[PDB]
Amino acid sequence: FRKMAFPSGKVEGCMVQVTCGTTTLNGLWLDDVVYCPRNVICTSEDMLNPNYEDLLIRKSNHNFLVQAGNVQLRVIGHSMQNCVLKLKVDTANPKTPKYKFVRIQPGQTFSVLACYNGSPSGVYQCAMRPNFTIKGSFLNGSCGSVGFNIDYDCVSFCYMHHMELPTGVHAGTDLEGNFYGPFVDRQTAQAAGTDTTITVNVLAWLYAAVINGDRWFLNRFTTTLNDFNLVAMKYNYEPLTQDHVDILGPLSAQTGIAVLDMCASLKELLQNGMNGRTILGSALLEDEFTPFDVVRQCS
Numbered sequence: 001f002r003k004m005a006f007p008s009g010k011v012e013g014c015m016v017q018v019t020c021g022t023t024t025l026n027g028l029w030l031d032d033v034v035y036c037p038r039n040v041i042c043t044s045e046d047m048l049n050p051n052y053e054d055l056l057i058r059k060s061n062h063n064f065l066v067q068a069g070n071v072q073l074r075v076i077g078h079s080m081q082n083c084v085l086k087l088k089v090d091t092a093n094p095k096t097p098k099y100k101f102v103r104i105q106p107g108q109t110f111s112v113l114a115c116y117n118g119s120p121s122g123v124y125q126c127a128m129r130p131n132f133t134i135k136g137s138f139l140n141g142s143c144g145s146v147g148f149n150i151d152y153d154c155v156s157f158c159y160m161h162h163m164e165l166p167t168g169v170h171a172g173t174d175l176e177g178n179f180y181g182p183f184v185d186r187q188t189a190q191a192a193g194t195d196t197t198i199t200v201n202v203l204a205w206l207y208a209a210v211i212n213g214d215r216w217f218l219n220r221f222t223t224t225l226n227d228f229n230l231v232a233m234k235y236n237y238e239p240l241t242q243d244h245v246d247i248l249g250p251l252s253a254q255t256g257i258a259v260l261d262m263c264a265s266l267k268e269l270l271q272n273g274m275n276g277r278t279i280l281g282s283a284l285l286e287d288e289f290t291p292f293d294v295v296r297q298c299s
């Protein structure tokens with residue numbers, strides 16, 4: 001049961017490289033605007049404690065070298081929107097897809113087109129952790145790469161990678177420059193806080209395991225939401241809400257296993273472990289498939 005990324009074509013024609021000083025990173029070219037992390041304007045000394053307003057005032061349009069494939073895009077304007085830099089250029093991207101900017105919730109998933117210096121290298125499916133970090137070693141060289149979902153014909157951009165925290169975990173913003181989580185684009189000590197397991201996603205993955213024949217872990221017990229959540233808190237699982245129950249509706253309907261029934265099976269797995277067995281070929285419970293993801297990749 002494999003992670004699936006959205007097809008990346010519509011985003012590939014939007015990826016450009018942005019250089020300021022010694023720093024090159026990735027930028028997103030939509031219409032006549034290139035979006036990228038504002039930390040591109042910082043020198044290594046600047047990053048310790050940048051005044052971005054003052055730094056941005058020192059820069060001129062010619063300080064920003066933007067290139068799409070071959071043609072290099074003349075920057076005719078530079079503006080800051082929270083933590084994203086907006087480089088206005090004199091050419092609208094002819095490959096611009098229908099798109100929207102959306103802010104996602106912790107636990108939601110998205111595809112990242114990982115790029116090096118403007119060039120697409122690969123696509124990865126990830127999740128926004130409960131603590132608003134993104135797990136994924138590939139983001140180390142991919143500053144300015146973006147995360148997205150495709151909803152019908154529209155690319156919904158939800159993430160732009162900005163930095164690694166001193167622990168190594170990855171942090172970024174929505175496309176209007178607001179960080180996910182309590183993080184700032186400054187090179188200083190910053191803690192992400194306890195990450196937890198996305199409970200509703202584990203339940204969705206257990207349903208996928210049932211749909212694919214893997215059902216040894218089903219027991220006959222049931223549970224109430226309150227009793228389950230007491231167990232969940234113990235193992236650093238996120239609390240399950242009635243909204244999460246409703247979202248799991250379609251999967252219960254297809255399988256015939258009520259949601260609280262499945263919660264009782266998960267409780268038993270949390271208390272007892274798997275005793276050396278696997279589920280969907282995994283020895284650990286997977287929490288980076290959403291209920292929508294499982295629905296989409298089953299029928």
Ligand SMILES: [Cl-]
Nearest residue numbers: 219261264265
């Ligand atoms: Cl059960």
